[PDB]
Coordinates of C-alpha atoms and ligand atoms in Angstrom, one line a residue:
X599 CA 0.2 -0.1 0.0
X600 CA 1.7 3.2 -1.5
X601 CA 1.2 6.7 -3.0
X602 CA 3.2 8.7 -5.2
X603 CA 4.6 12.4 -5.8
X604 CA 6.0 14.5 -8.2
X605 CA 9.0 12.9 -6.7
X606 CA 8.0 9.6 -8.4
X607 CA 8.6 9.0 -12.1
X608 CA 5.7 7.0 -12.4
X609 CA 3.8 9.9 -11.0
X610 CA 3.1 11.6 -13.9
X611 CA 1.8 8.7 -16.1
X612 CA -0.3 7.6 -13.4
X613 CA -2.0 10.5 -13.3
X614 CA -2.7 10.4 -16.9
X615 CA -3.9 6.7 -16.9
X616 CA -5.8 6.4 -13.3
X617 CA -6.9 10.0 -12.6
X618 CA -7.0 12.2 -15.5
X619 CA -10.3 14.2 -14.7
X620 CA -8.0 15.5 -12.1
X621 CA -6.6 18.6 -13.0
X622 CA -3.9 21.2 -11.8
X623 CA -3.4 25.1 -12.0
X624 CA -0.3 26.0 -10.3
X625 CA -0.4 29.4 -8.5
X626 CA 1.2 30.7 -11.7
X627 CA -1.7 31.0 -13.8
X628 CA -3.4 32.8 -11.2
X629 CA -3.1 36.9 -11.3
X630 CA -1.4 38.4 -8.3
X631 CA -4.2 40.5 -7.5
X632 CA -6.4 37.8 -7.5
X633 CA -4.0 36.4 -4.9
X634 CA -3.9 39.4 -2.8
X635 CA -7.7 39.8 -2.8
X636 CA -8.6 36.4 -2.1
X637 CA -6.0 36.0 0.5
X638 CA -7.0 39.4 2.1
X639 CA -10.4 38.0 2.3
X640 CA -9.3 34.9 4.3
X641 CA -7.4 36.6 6.9
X642 CA -10.2 39.1 7.0
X643 CA -12.9 36.5 7.5
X644 CA -10.5 34.7 10.1
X645 CA -10.0 38.1 12.1
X646 CA -14.0 38.6 12.1
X647 CA -14.2 35.0 13.4
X648 CA -16.7 33.7 10.8
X649 CA -15.1 29.9 10.7
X650 CA -16.5 27.7 12.7
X651 CA -16.1 24.0 13.8
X652 CA -19.1 22.1 12.3
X653 CA -20.8 19.7 14.9
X654 CA -21.7 16.8 12.3
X655 CA -23.3 12.9 12.5
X656 CA -21.6 10.0 11.6
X657 CA -22.1 6.8 11.8
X658 CA -24.6 7.5 14.6
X659 CA -21.7 9.5 16.2
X660 CA -21.6 13.7 17.2
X661 CA -18.3 15.1 16.0
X662 CA -16.7 18.2 15.6
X663 CA -14.5 18.4 12.6
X664 CA -11.0 19.2 13.1
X665 CA -11.6 22.2 10.3
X666 CA -13.2 25.5 10.7
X667 CA -15.5 26.4 7.9
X668 CA -17.9 28.6 6.4
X669 CA -20.4 28.8 3.5
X670 CA -20.8 31.3 1.3
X671 CA -23.0 31.6 -1.4
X672 CA -26.0 32.5 -4.0
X673 CA -28.7 34.3 -1.2
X674 CA -31.1 31.7 0.2
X675 CA -28.9 28.6 -1.0
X676 CA -27.7 25.7 1.3
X677 CA -25.2 22.9 1.0
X678 CA -26.1 19.7 3.1
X679 CA -23.1 17.5 4.2
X680 CA -22.8 14.9 7.0
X681 CA -26.3 15.5 8.0
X682 CA -25.4 19.0 8.6
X683 CA -27.2 22.0 6.6
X684 CA -25.1 24.7 6.1
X685 CA -26.7 27.9 4.9
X686 CA -24.6 30.8 2.8
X687 CA -23.5 33.9 3.9
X688 CA -24.9 35.5 1.0
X689 CA -22.4 37.0 -1.8
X690 CA -23.6 40.0 -4.3
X691 CA -24.9 37.9 -7.2
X692 CA -26.9 39.4 -9.9
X693 CA -29.7 41.2 -8.9
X694 CA -28.7 41.1 -5.5
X695 CA -29.6 43.6 -2.3
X696 CA -27.9 41.4 0.5
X697 CA -27.8 44.7 2.9
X698 CA -26.2 42.3 5.4
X699 CA -22.8 42.1 6.7
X700 CA -19.9 44.6 8.8
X701 CA -18.3 46.3 5.8
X702 CA -15.1 43.9 5.4
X703 CA -17.1 40.9 5.8
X704 CA -19.4 41.7 2.7
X705 CA -16.2 43.1 0.5
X706 CA -14.8 39.3 1.4
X707 CA -18.0 37.9 -0.2
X708 CA -17.5 39.8 -3.1
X709 CA -14.2 38.7 -3.4
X710 CA -15.1 35.3 -3.4
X711 CA -17.7 35.2 -5.8
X712 CA -15.0 37.2 -7.8
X713 CA -12.9 34.2 -7.4
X714 CA -15.9 31.9 -8.3
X715 CA -16.5 33.8 -11.6
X716 CA -12.8 33.1 -12.6
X717 CA -12.7 29.3 -11.6
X718 CA -16.0 28.8 -13.5
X719 CA -14.1 30.3 -16.6
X720 CA -11.1 28.1 -16.0
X721 CA -13.4 24.7 -15.4
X722 CA -15.1 25.5 -18.3
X723 CA -11.9 25.5 -20.6
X724 CA -10.6 22.4 -18.9
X725 CA -14.4 20.5 -19.3
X726 CA -13.8 21.8 -23.1
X727 CA -10.6 20.4 -23.2
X728 CA -11.6 16.9 -21.7
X729 CA -14.3 16.9 -24.0
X730 CA -12.2 17.4 -27.1
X731 CA -9.9 14.7 -25.9
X732 CA -12.9 12.1 -25.5
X733 CA -13.6 13.3 -28.9
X734 CA -10.2 11.4 -30.2
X735 CA -23.7 19.3 -25.0
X736 CA -22.4 22.9 -24.3
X737 CA -25.6 23.3 -21.9
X738 CA -24.5 20.5 -19.7
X739 CA -21.0 21.7 -19.5
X740 CA -22.1 25.3 -18.5
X741 CA -24.6 23.7 -16.0
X742 CA -21.5 21.4 -14.5
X743 CA -19.5 24.4 -13.7
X744 CA -22.3 26.8 -12.3
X745 CA -20.7 27.2 -9.1
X746 CA -23.5 28.1 -6.6
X747 CA -21.7 28.2 -3.2
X748 CA -18.3 27.8 -2.3
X749 CA -17.5 26.2 1.1
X750 CA -14.3 27.7 2.9
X751 CA -12.0 26.1 5.3
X752 CA -9.2 26.9 7.7
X753 CA -7.1 24.7 10.1
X754 CA -4.1 25.7 12.1
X755 CA -2.4 22.0 12.5
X756 CA -0.2 23.9 15.4
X757 CA -3.6 24.6 17.3
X758 CA -5.3 21.7 15.9
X759 CA -2.9 18.7 16.3
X760 CA -5.3 15.7 16.8
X761 CA -5.0 14.1 13.4
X762 CA -5.8 10.9 12.2
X763 CA -2.9 8.8 10.2
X764 CA -3.8 8.0 6.7
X765 CA -4.3 4.4 7.0
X766 CA -3.5 2.9 3.4
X767 CA -1.1 4.5 1.4
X768 CA 1.3 6.1 4.4
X769 CA 0.2 9.5 3.3
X770 CA 0.5 10.9 7.2
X771 CA -1.8 13.4 9.0
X772 CA -5.2 13.7 7.8
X773 CA -7.1 17.1 7.9
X774 CA -10.0 15.6 6.2
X775 CA -10.3 11.6 5.8
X776 CA -11.1 9.7 2.7
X777 CA -14.7 10.8 1.3
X778 CA -16.7 11.9 -1.9
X779 CA -18.4 15.0 -1.8
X780 CA -22.4 14.5 -1.0
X781 CA -25.2 16.8 -2.6
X782 CA -23.5 17.8 -5.8
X783 CA -25.1 18.0 -9.0
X784 CA -24.5 14.6 -11.1
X785 CA -21.2 15.0 -13.0
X786 CA -20.9 18.5 -11.8
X787 CA -17.0 20.1 -11.2
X788 CA -15.6 21.0 -7.9
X789 CA -12.9 23.7 -8.0
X790 CA -10.4 24.4 -5.1
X791 CA -8.3 27.5 -4.3
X792 CA -6.1 26.2 -1.7
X793 CA -4.0 28.9 0.2
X794 CA -1.1 27.5 2.7
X795 CA 0.4 30.1 4.7
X796 CA 4.2 29.8 4.1
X797 CA 13.3 11.4 1.9
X798 CA 10.8 8.9 1.2
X799 CA 7.1 9.7 0.2
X800 CA 5.3 12.9 0.7
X801 CA 6.8 15.8 2.6
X802 CA 4.9 15.9 6.0
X803 CA 5.0 19.8 6.4
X804 CA 3.1 20.4 2.9
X805 CA -0.3 20.4 2.4
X806 CA -1.8 17.9 -0.1
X807 CA -4.9 16.6 -1.6
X808 CA -4.9 12.9 -2.2
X809 CA -6.7 10.8 -4.4
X810 CA -7.7 7.1 -4.6
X811 CA -10.1 4.8 -6.7
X812 CA -13.2 3.9 -5.1
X813 CA -12.6 0.3 -3.3
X814 CA -9.2 0.3 -4.3
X815 CA -6.1 0.4 -2.1
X816 CA -4.1 -1.7 -4.7
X817 CA -3.8 0.9 -7.3
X818 CA -1.3 3.6 -5.6
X819 CA -3.1 6.6 -4.4
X820 CA -2.0 10.6 -5.4
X821 CA -0.7 12.9 -3.2
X822 CA -0.5 16.1 -4.8
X823 CA 1.4 18.9 -3.3
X824 CA -0.5 22.3 -2.7
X825 CA 1.6 25.1 -2.1
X826 CA 0.3 29.1 -2.0
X827 CA -2.6 29.9 -4.0
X828 CA -2.4 26.5 -6.0
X829 CA -5.7 25.5 -7.8
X830 CA -6.9 21.8 -8.6
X831 CA -10.3 20.9 -10.2
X832 CA -12.4 17.7 -9.8
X833 CA -14.1 17.3 -13.5
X834 CA -17.0 14.9 -14.2
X835 CA -17.2 11.4 -12.8
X836 CA -14.1 12.1 -11.0
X837 CA -16.1 12.6 -7.6
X838 CA -17.9 9.4 -8.0
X839 CA -15.2 6.9 -9.1
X840 CA -12.6 8.3 -6.8
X841 CA -12.2 9.4 -3.2
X842 CA -10.3 12.2 -2.0
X843 CA -8.4 13.3 1.5
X844 CA -6.5 16.5 2.7
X845 CA -3.4 15.8 4.0
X846 CA -2.2 18.4 6.8
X847 CA 1.1 20.2 6.7
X848 CA 2.7 21.8 9.4
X849 CA 1.4 25.4 8.8
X850 CA -1.9 27.3 8.6
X851 CA -3.8 26.4 5.4
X852 CA -7.2 28.1 3.9
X853 CA -9.3 26.4 1.1
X854 CA -12.0 27.8 -0.7
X855 CA -14.3 24.5 -2.2
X856 CA -16.3 25.6 -5.4
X857 CA -19.5 23.3 -5.8
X858 CA -22.6 23.2 -7.6
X859 CA -24.8 22.1 -5.0
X860 CA -27.9 20.1 -5.7
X861 CA -30.3 22.5 -4.4
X862 CA -33.5 21.1 -5.8
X863 CA -35.1 21.0 -2.3
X864 CA -32.2 23.2 -0.8
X865 CA -33.2 26.7 -1.2
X866 CA -35.5 29.1 1.0
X867 CA -37.7 29.8 -2.3
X868 CA -38.2 25.9 -2.3
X869 CA -38.8 25.6 1.2
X870 CA -41.5 28.6 1.1
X871 CA -43.1 27.2 -2.0
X872 CA -43.6 24.2 0.2
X873 CA -45.4 25.9 3.0
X874 CA -47.6 27.8 0.8
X875 CA -48.6 24.5 -0.8
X876 CA -49.1 23.1 2.6
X877 CA -51.1 25.9 4.1
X878 CA -53.7 25.6 0.6
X879 CA -55.3 23.2 2.8
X880 CA -56.0 26.1 5.6
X881 CA -58.9 28.6 5.9
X882 CA -56.8 31.6 5.5
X883 CA -59.0 34.9 6.0
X884 CA -57.4 35.7 9.6
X885 CA -54.3 34.6 11.1
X886 CA -55.5 33.3 14.2
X887 CA -55.5 30.1 16.4
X888 CA -58.8 28.8 15.0
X889 CA -57.3 26.9 12.3
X890 CA -59.7 25.1 10.4
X891 CA -59.1 23.2 7.3
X892 CA -60.5 22.8 3.7
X893 CA -60.3 18.9 3.1
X894 CA -59.4 16.0 5.1
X895 CA -58.8 14.4 1.9
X896 CA -56.0 11.9 3.0
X897 CA -53.4 12.8 0.3
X898 CA -54.0 16.1 1.0
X899 CA -53.5 15.2 4.6
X900 CA -50.2 13.3 4.0
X901 CA -48.9 15.9 2.1
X902 CA -49.6 18.3 4.8
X903 CA -48.0 16.7 7.8
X904 CA -44.9 15.4 5.4
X905 CA -44.0 19.3 4.8
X906 CA -44.3 20.2 8.4
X907 CA -41.4 17.6 9.1
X908 CA -39.5 19.1 6.4
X909 CA -39.7 22.7 7.4
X910 CA -39.1 21.7 10.9
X911 CA -36.5 19.1 10.6
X912 CA -34.6 19.9 7.6
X913 CA -34.7 23.9 7.7
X914 CA -35.8 25.1 11.4
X915 CA -33.9 22.7 13.8
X916 CA -30.7 22.3 11.3
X917 CA -30.8 26.2 11.6
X918 CA -30.9 26.6 15.3
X919 CA -28.3 23.6 16.3
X920 CA -25.8 25.5 14.6
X921 CA -26.3 28.1 17.6
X922 CA -27.3 31.0 15.5
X923 CA -23.6 31.0 14.4
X924 CA -23.1 33.6 11.2
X925 CA -25.5 36.0 13.0
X926 CA -22.0 37.2 13.5
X927 CA -21.3 37.7 9.6
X928 CA -24.8 38.6 8.4
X929 CA -28.5 38.6 9.4
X930 CA -29.9 37.5 5.8
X931 CA -31.9 34.4 7.1
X932 CA -33.1 36.2 10.6
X933 CA -36.3 37.0 8.8
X934 CA -36.7 34.2 6.6
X935 CA -36.3 31.8 9.7
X936 CA -38.9 34.0 11.7
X937 CA -41.2 33.6 8.7
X938 CA -40.6 29.8 8.3
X939 CA -41.0 29.5 12.2
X940 CA -44.4 31.2 11.8
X941 CA -45.3 28.7 9.0
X942 CA -44.4 26.0 11.0
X943 CA -46.2 26.8 14.0
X944 CA -49.6 27.2 12.1
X945 CA -48.7 23.8 10.9
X946 CA -48.6 22.6 14.4
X947 CA -52.2 24.2 14.1
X948 CA -53.2 22.0 11.2
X949 CA -51.8 19.0 13.1
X950 CA -54.0 19.6 15.8
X951 CA -56.8 20.5 13.5
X952 CA -56.7 16.6 11.9
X953 CA -56.3 15.1 15.5
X954 CA -59.7 17.1 16.4
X955 CA -61.2 15.4 13.4
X956 CA -60.0 12.3 14.1
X957 CA -61.8 12.1 17.4
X958 CA -65.1 14.1 16.1
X959 CA -68.6 12.3 17.0
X960 CA -70.1 11.5 13.8
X961 CA -66.8 10.5 11.9
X962 CA -67.4 7.0 10.3
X963 CA -64.4 5.0 11.3
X964 CA -63.7 4.1 7.7
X965 CA -62.8 7.9 6.8
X966 CA -60.9 7.8 10.2
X967 CA -58.7 5.0 9.6
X968 CA -58.2 6.2 6.2
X969 CA -56.9 9.6 7.9
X970 CA -55.0 7.7 10.6
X971 CA -53.3 5.4 7.7
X972 CA -52.5 8.7 5.6
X973 CA -50.8 10.5 8.9
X974 CA -49.2 8.0 11.1
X975 CA -45.7 7.7 9.3
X976 CA -45.5 11.4 9.4
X977 CA -46.2 11.7 12.9
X978 CA -43.9 8.7 13.8
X979 CA -40.9 9.9 12.0
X980 CA -41.7 13.6 13.7
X981 CA -41.4 11.7 17.2
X982 CA -38.6 9.9 16.4
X983 CA -36.9 12.7 14.5
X984 CA -37.6 15.2 17.6
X985 CA -36.1 12.3 20.2
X986 CA -33.0 12.4 17.9
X987 CA -32.7 16.4 17.4
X988 CA -33.2 16.8 21.1
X989 CA -30.4 14.4 21.9
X990 CA -28.2 16.0 19.5
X991 CA -28.4 18.8 21.1
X992 CA -27.8 17.7 24.3
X993 CA -24.8 15.7 23.4
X994 CA -21.6 15.8 25.4
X995 CA -19.4 17.3 23.0
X996 CA -22.2 20.0 22.2
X997 CA -22.2 21.2 25.6
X998 CA -18.8 22.1 25.8
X999 CA -18.9 24.4 23.0
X1000 CA -18.9 28.7 23.2
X1001 CA -22.2 30.5 24.1
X1002 CA -22.2 32.1 20.9
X1003 CA -22.4 28.2 19.3
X1004 CA -24.4 26.5 22.0
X1005 CA -26.8 24.2 20.0
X1006 CA -30.1 25.6 20.5
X1007 CA -32.7 23.3 20.7
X1008 CA -35.4 25.1 18.8
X1009 CA -38.3 25.1 18.7
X1010 CA -39.2 23.5 22.2
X1011 CA -41.9 23.9 24.7
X1012 CA -43.1 23.0 27.8
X1013 CA -46.3 20.9 28.5
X1014 CA -47.1 23.9 30.7
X1015 CA -46.8 25.8 27.7
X1016 CA -50.6 27.0 26.7
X1017 CA -49.4 29.0 23.4
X1018 CA -48.6 25.6 21.5
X1019 CA -51.7 23.4 20.9
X1020 CA -49.8 20.3 20.8
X1021 CA -46.8 18.9 23.1
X1022 CA -43.5 18.8 22.2
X1023 CA -43.6 14.5 22.8
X1024 CA -46.1 13.1 20.8
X1025 CA -45.5 9.1 21.8
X1026 CA -49.0 9.2 23.6
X1027 CA -50.7 10.6 20.7
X1028 CA -49.2 8.2 18.1
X1029 CA -49.8 5.2 20.8
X1030 CA -53.8 6.6 20.8
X1031 CA -53.7 6.4 16.9
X1032 CA -52.1 3.3 16.6
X1033 CA -54.3 1.7 19.2
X1034 CA -57.2 3.1 17.2
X1035 CA -56.0 1.8 13.7
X1036 CA -56.0 -1.8 15.1
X1037 CA -59.5 -1.7 17.1
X1038 CA -61.4 -5.1 16.6
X1039 CA -63.2 -5.4 13.4
Ligands
NKG119 O1 -9.6 21.6 1.3 C1 -9.4 20.6 -0.1 O2 -8.6 21.0 -0.6 C2 -10.5 19.5 0.1 N1 -12.0 20.1 0.1 C3 -12.4 18.9 0.6 O3 -12.5 17.7 0.2 C4 -13.9 19.2 1.8 N2 -14.8 18.2 1.6 C5 -15.7 18.7 2.3 C6 -17.2 17.5 2.4 C7 -18.0 17.6 1.5 C8 -19.2 16.4 1.5 C9 -19.1 15.6 1.8 C10 -18.0 15.3 2.7 C11 -17.5 14.0 3.7 C12 -16.6 13.9 4.6 C13 -15.7 14.8 4.4 C14 -15.6 15.9 3.8 C15 -16.6 16.5 2.8 C16 -16.1 19.7 2.7 C17 -15.3 20.8 2.9 C18 -14.2 20.7 2.2 O4 -13.3 21.3 2.1
ZN120 ZN1 -14.4 16.8 -0.2

């Protein structure tokens, strides 16, 4: 089990033969102005403390990433990985009015937008070249380079020295283990700008990106040295056929990883449209607590309860688990989250209305049982997911974080709370409904 670096004769040919959708643009091909702007933007976002270690979940374990991160991108866009939905700090894309940041921060976002445009152009060029090599559509290519977000990383290996050893090729210390990037548009490229501050095998003191073939530890892995401002590109199916990792050096290092996030169910607009659809079933002359529904058709109720779950667990809890970090950097999401929370509270109202109907004196049991069968999976999931999020929020690792990042379990209410129609813990309700469904016939 071994690896190759530029110091190996076989390196270049092995790069050609087993890893040709991996492209490398050395810092030289990038303008000094852009380097400067980008690097000052990294340092800027670092000074203002905008990068946070994520509290992710892997194989059922709550883990703090060694790396500090922040997501920057199109307004209203999210990127979900390791069960953790990141919300963009917005950059000023076309027809945008952010009005949300502290001067320097905004300028940094603008910069990473500029970086994004450049890397996009380079990715398009390289993908052209690749298709032309293949020769020996255009919309597809522009589509696979349309980076809508960048995920920024920082790590100081001197302050963060608790790093695993690369287990298969002897590549040494890993900042990030072997993985595929999730939640990307199919066959979409990833473009990385790497900014490192200042013998057998790979140089331990220099940062590398490592690549291997999926399922395969026989084919030697590649360890690519990254210096200051080097760029690399994972093109086409590389991210699917291969795995990559980050090999830490000794100095601090920043990176900007530009992605086409698969946000078809990952944007504010999308989840507001979903909420609007759920509340089509609600009589909406006035906003009060007397929620009354237009139909108890099972399909409509199932849909409603499914959307309720989606806005609660994919949006509100995800957002508040992060402890309102990035309020530091922008207030963009404050109103939208308030709005999604109000919509969700109304849906608590809807559920209550269904539970009210299910108990109604003159409701024929057949219709009742149709309703129960329609909503039960949703309520069961709501209960299990609430147990999970509550536990995730209270975990030992979670309580150790600063007060500026303390996982707020939200929304959360006590039974003594008369403002909420339904209890947080639905155990008894789900029991009753199941009991009802199995009554003698
Ligand atoms: O810095 C580099 O040169 C390489 N960056 C990443 O690979 C990277 N990968 C992920 C990532 C995305 C999706 C799923 C993952 C699963 C495990 C580890 C990283 C993952 C996140 C931030 C990153 O910076
Ligand atoms: Zn990755």
